[PDB]
Design a protein around this motif. Structure first.
Motif, PDB file in Angstrom:
ATOM      1  N   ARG A  56       0.825  -1.201   0.000  1.00 28.53           N
ATOM      2  CA  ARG A  56       0.000   0.000   0.000  1.00 28.53           C
ATOM      3  C   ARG A  56       0.861   1.254   0.000  1.00 28.53           C
ATOM      4  NH1 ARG A  56      -4.018  -2.986   2.403  1.00 28.53           N
ATOM      5  NH2 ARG A  56      -3.126  -3.060   4.515  1.00 28.53           N
TER       6      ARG A  56
ATOM      7  N   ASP B 137      -0.012   3.630  -3.520  1.00 22.59           N
ATOM      8  CA  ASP B 137      -0.703   4.559  -2.647  1.00 22.59           C
ATOM      9  C   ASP B 137      -2.064   4.920  -3.223  1.00 22.59           C
ATOM     10  OD1 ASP B 137       0.182   6.076  -4.814  1.00 22.59           O
ATOM     11  OD2 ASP B 137       1.811   7.002  -3.673  1.00 22.59           O
ATOM     12  N   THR B 138      -2.877   5.604  -2.428  1.00 20.03           N
ATOM     13  CA  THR B 138      -4.173   6.086  -2.890  1.00 20.03           C
ATOM     14  C   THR B 138      -4.010   7.096  -4.031  1.00 20.03           C
ATOM     15  OG1 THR B 138      -4.190   7.789  -1.180  1.00 20.03           O
ATOM     16  CG2 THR B 138      -5.259   5.692  -0.677  1.00 20.03           C
TER      17      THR B 138
ATOM     18  N   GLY C  49      -4.712   5.686  -7.120  1.00 19.76           N
ATOM     19  CA  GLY C  49      -6.137   5.451  -7.256  1.00 19.76           C
ATOM     20  C   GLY C  49      -6.536   4.084  -6.720  1.00 19.76           C
TER      21      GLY C  49
ATOM     22  N   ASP D 262      -7.045   0.770  -4.216  1.00 12.60           N
ATOM     23  CA  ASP D 262      -7.569   0.559  -2.861  1.00 12.60           C
ATOM     24  C   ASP D 262      -7.328  -0.866  -2.409  1.00 12.60           C
ATOM     25  OD1 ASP D 262      -9.531   1.714  -0.595  1.00 12.60           O
ATOM     26  OD2 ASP D 262     -10.118  -0.356  -1.031  1.00 12.60           O
TER      27      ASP D 262
ATOM     28  N   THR E 135      -7.096  -2.376   0.569  1.00 15.28           N
ATOM     29  CA  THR E 135      -7.524  -2.853   1.885  1.00 15.28           C
ATOM     30  C   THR E 135      -8.300  -4.161   1.807  1.00 15.28           C
ATOM     31  OG1 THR E 135      -9.621  -1.600   1.956  1.00 15.28           O
ATOM     32  CG2 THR E 135      -7.640  -0.470   2.728  1.00 15.28           C
TER      33      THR E 135
END
Lengths: 49, 49
Positions: free
Chosen positions: A12, A16-17, A20, A22, A24
């Motif tokens: 992660r 990274d966010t 874009g 996700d 988790t």
């Protein structure tokens, strides 16, 4: 000691966010990219994979 | 001899056996269905007759 289970996940911190992505849920999931037409709402979700 | 049809001849007969239902045929249990649409409009097979 006591680590119940140890997985090999996508990073992660790298995906990274800002990418874009996700992570988790245990798979990458980029919203609003390859979204299908002509389907009921919520049917888009698999394509996020 | 067999009995002559009432409609065969020109006499008027003021008594007859009328068939009838014992009660109203509109019970009020109108038929209702569950229409359930195609999942994807693109996926529909228009083809083959």
């Amino acid at each position: 000691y006591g680590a119940a289970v140890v997985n090999i996940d996508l990073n992660r911190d790298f995906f990274d966010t800002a990418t874009g992505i996700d992570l988790t849920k245990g798979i990458p999931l980029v919203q609003d990219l390859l979204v299908p037409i002509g389907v009921t709402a919520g049917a888009e979700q698999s394509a996020e994979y | 001899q067999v009995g002559i049809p009432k409609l065969e001849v020109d006499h008027i007969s003021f008594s007859n056996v009328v068939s009838m239902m014992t009660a109203n045929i509109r019970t009020g249990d109108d038929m209702a269905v569950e229409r359930v649409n195609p999942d994807d409009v693109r996926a529909i097979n228009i083809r083959n007759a």
